[PDB]
Amino acid sequence: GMLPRLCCLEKGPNGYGFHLHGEKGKLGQYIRLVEPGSPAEKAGLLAGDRLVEVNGENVEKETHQQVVSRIRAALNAVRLLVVDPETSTTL
Ligand SMILES: [Cl-]
């Protein structure tokens, strides 16, 4: 598996500046819409990142709502372990 990567975000006055987005039924939570100039951008989060841990807790087997709660629970910073999306494919 692709080496996961740690991103350490510091919460700003409007939060972190990303969307957390899941799928229909197929399990995973993904980062989308990393806002320009945001704490998420500065921490190196990328659209399409799959979220594996929040503050050291594996969240691969938690619901969307639970993962949101884990991120919001953190008072002013959050550590996100992600797996980055593929960038090379042979056709
Ligand atoms: Cl990914």
| Domain containing residue 78: CATH number | 2.30.42.10
Report CA(86)–ligand 1 centroid distance (Å).
Answer: 7
- What's the 11 CA to ligand 1 centre distance in angstroms? 23
PDB experimental method: X-ray
Residues whose Cβ atom is located within 5 A of ion ligand 1: 50, 83, 85
Q: List the resolution, Å.
A: 1.1
User: With contact defined as beta carbons under 8 Å apart, do 18 and 38 qualify?
Assistant: yes
| Alpha helix segments (H runs only) across the chain | 39-42, 64-73
Measured between alpha carbons, how far is 24 from 14 in angstroms, rounded to an integer?
28
Distance from the Cα of residue 56 to its chain's centroid: 13
- 38 Cα: distance to centroid of ligand 1 (angstroms): 20
State whether residue 39 is helix, strand or coil.
helix
Q: Which domain holds residue 73?
A: 1-91
Number of domains in the chain: 1
